């Protein structure tokens, strides 16, 4: 690995903590991250190997980092910090985000500490990351409430969209140690026809706007996988959540129109979502 001094960052300033989740992140203090603080501690999250990895498994992180280089930095992203790849194993150095994932931190949140006007907000906070992501030509892929996480200060930061992907080899029937089923966040094209845009992103997002007004729900409730291939087939589409206004579930449906082409934009969704926070009660 080449040294590239503009990212570099010396692995004894590090002190790394209790895993995050599992290669494997785990939690850590930095000091000096900013140079003009040189014994100021941060929290940071730190991505490395997992013991006994592949090579495979090593080049997929590599390719993340150098991701994560080219993206350059916004507000509503987890973005990198620093890299330790000298004389030591590799370390992948990101933003920390204290309150976890989305989706947890909806659950944990049912009544109620969740506002009408904060939900729109994380919905509007997650399209302007993607708007961003989508101008730096970055398909997520895989957009959902637990790829997003959220800081000490309620602000909404994408995660995992700089992942190596196999999207020749998903499965589909696939179940996390959590329960999820990620094929019920791919839009129709990807699921059949194997084609990824940033309009299928914007499906996804749909489905993740389902979660946050189900205050983290899982999309198409009781329904497994061999049943969500014949109802996609078939034009289904989840019905709208309880407590949930028009204006948003008119814009789920939107998002999940069958021709990627009518779908709006993220800067469409910002726009709309930036509209109904405007029209919040004073």
């Keep these: 690995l080449p040294?590239?001094?503009?990212?570099?960052?010396?692995?004894?300033?590090?002190?790394?903590?209790?895993?995050?989740?599992?290669?494997?992140?785990?939690?850590?203090?930095?000091?000096?991250?900013?140079?003009?603080?040189?014994?100021?501690?941060?929290?940071?999250?730190?991505?490395?190997?997992?013991?006994?990895?592949?090579?495979?498994?090593?080049?997929?992180?590599?390719?993340?980092?150098?991701?994560?280089?080219?993206?350059?930095?916004?507000?509503?992203?987890?973005?990198?910090?620093?890299?330790?790849?000298?004389?030591?194993?590799l370390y992948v150095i990101l933003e920390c985000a204290a309150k976890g994932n989305l989706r947890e931190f909806l659950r944990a949140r049912r009544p109620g500490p969740l506002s009408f006007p904060v939900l729109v907000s994380c919905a509007?906070?997650?399209?302007?990351?993607?708007?961003?992501?989508?101008?730096?030509?970055?398909?997520?892929?895989?957009?959902?409430?637990?790829?997003?996480?959220?800081?000490?200060?309620?602000?909404?930061?994408?995660?995992?969209?700089?992942?190596?992907?196999?999207?020749?080899?998903?499965?589909?029937?696939?179940?996390?140690?959590?329960?999820?089923?990620?094929?019920?966040?791919?839009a129709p094209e990807a699921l059949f026809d194997e084609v990824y845009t940033h309009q299928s992103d914007v499906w996804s997002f749909g489905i993740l706007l389902w979660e946050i007004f189900t205050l983290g729900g899982s999309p198409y409730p009781g329904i497994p996988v061999e049943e969500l291939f014949s109802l996609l087939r078939e034009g289904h589409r989840m019905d709208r959540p309880p407590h949930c206004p028009p204006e948003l579930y008119g814009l789920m449906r939107e998002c999940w129109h069958a021709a990627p082409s009518q779908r709006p934009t993220f800067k469409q969704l910002v726009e709309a979502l930036d509209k109904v926070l405007l029209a919040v009660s004073e």
């Excluded at 000490?152 to 089923?181: C, P, Q, W």
Aim: glycine share 8%.
């Design 3 to 89: 040294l590239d001094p503009l990212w570099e960052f010396p692995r004894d300033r590090l002190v790394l903590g209790k895993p995050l989740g599992e290669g494997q992140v785990v939690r850590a203090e930095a000091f000096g991250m900013d140079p003009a603080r040189p014994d100021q501690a941060s929290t940071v999250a730190v991505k490395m190997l997992k013991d006994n990895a592949s090579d495979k498994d090593l080049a997929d992180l590599v390719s993340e980092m150098e991701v994560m280089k080219l993206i350059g930095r916004h507000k509503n992203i987890i973005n990198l910090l620093g890299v330790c790849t000298q004389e030591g194993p």
């Design 124 to 186: 509007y906070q997650v399209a302007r990351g993607m708007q961003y992501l989508e101008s730096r030509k970055c398909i997520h892929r895989d957009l959902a409430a637990r790829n997003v996480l959220v800081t000490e200060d309620n602000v909404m930061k994408i995660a995992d969209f700089g992942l190596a992907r196999g999207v020749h080899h998903i499965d589909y029937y696939k179940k996390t140690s959590n329960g999820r089923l990620p094929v019920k966040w791919m």
